[PDB]
Enzyme design. Sequence first.
Site, PDB file in Angstrom:
ATOM      1  N   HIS A  61      -9.358   0.169   8.067  1.00 48.26           N
ATOM      2  CA  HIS A  61      -8.056  -0.030   7.450  1.00 48.26           C
ATOM      3  C   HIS A  61      -7.572  -1.416   7.851  1.00 48.26           C
ATOM      4  O   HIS A  61      -7.981  -1.955   8.881  1.00 48.26           O
ATOM      5  CB  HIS A  61      -7.062   1.054   7.897  1.00 48.26           C
ATOM      6  CG  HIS A  61      -5.706   0.937   7.273  1.00 48.26           C
ATOM      7  ND1 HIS A  61      -5.518   0.549   5.964  1.00 48.26           N
ATOM      8  CD2 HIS A  61      -4.470   1.144   7.785  1.00 48.26           C
ATOM      9  CE1 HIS A  61      -4.225   0.532   5.694  1.00 48.26           C
ATOM     10  NE2 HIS A  61      -3.567   0.887   6.783  1.00 48.26           N
ATOM     11  N   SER A 104      -1.126   1.895   2.388  1.00 46.02           N
ATOM     12  CA  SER A 104      -1.927   2.913   3.043  1.00 46.02           C
ATOM     13  C   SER A 104      -1.732   4.225   2.309  1.00 46.02           C
ATOM     14  O   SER A 104      -0.792   4.391   1.534  1.00 46.02           O
ATOM     15  CB  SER A 104      -1.528   3.052   4.518  1.00 46.02           C
ATOM     16  OG  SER A 104      -2.359   3.968   5.213  1.00 46.02           O
ATOM     17  N   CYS A 135      -5.834  -1.118   0.541  1.00 45.64           N
ATOM     18  CA  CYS A 135      -5.354  -1.795   1.756  1.00 45.64           C
ATOM     19  C   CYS A 135      -5.643  -3.294   1.751  1.00 45.64           C
ATOM     20  O   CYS A 135      -4.770  -4.086   2.107  1.00 45.64           O
ATOM     21  CB  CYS A 135      -5.960  -1.145   3.009  1.00 45.64           C
ATOM     22  SG  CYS A 135      -6.305   0.656   2.932  1.00 45.64           S
TER      23      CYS A 135
END
Lengths: 235, 29
Positions: A136, A153, A101
């Site tokens: 994230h 992702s 990410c």
Amino acid sequence: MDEATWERMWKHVAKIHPDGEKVAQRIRGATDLPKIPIPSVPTFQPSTPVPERLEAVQRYIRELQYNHTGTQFFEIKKSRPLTGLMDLAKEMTKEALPIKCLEAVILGIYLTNSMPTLERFPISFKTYFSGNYFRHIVLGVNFAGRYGALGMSRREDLMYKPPAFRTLSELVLDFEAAYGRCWHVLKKVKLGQSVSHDPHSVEQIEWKHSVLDVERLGRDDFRKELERHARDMRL
Amino acid sequence: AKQKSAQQELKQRQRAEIYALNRVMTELE
């Protein structure tokens, strides 16, 4: 990478995979491995609208694939100046290895520096699930007043959003809804400032210009905070 | 020169194995 790093990766694979060693046995030294084509860096005509450019940038990022090996190939020091991170983005393009990410955010900036009408800014999420906390990050983008996202992702709905949302709040709550569908609660959202389009810039990315506690804020206080932040990105 | 073709052939070999490994690790979910 060197030999120490290289043999680290395989010993780390030996631990985490059930039959860790036979996997190395079959792959290391193998003569008939699939040749992987090196992905072509996307270049754009000036007639191509920016949204079509973003689809091409996102396709290239996907093309590299998500890094499942458990060893990250491109270390990212979040405090490096932009010209240092852009040198590293150039090397991801030339080495062409799997990514996660944080690396896709740097790539997204590198590949959109040629689009001055496109605003780029990091959005990071902290979510909770089953006693564990999860972090994230994606690259928020604004074009012609509308919001979207580039990223990488493990889930399809936690990365790419085309720039169609009319406000920043709608973009972030779309992410919250996507987190809720896989039973993650959204705990905190960190939004950075716009990133300069100068790949030689000596400035840092401001990763944490706004930190919003989604539960201690409450729904409406969460949305007004995201809109003040959007306004603050129009300097 | 001949030193530099050994570093391009070592990185190509590693990439192939890295992607073979990534495939195996991806299909462990």
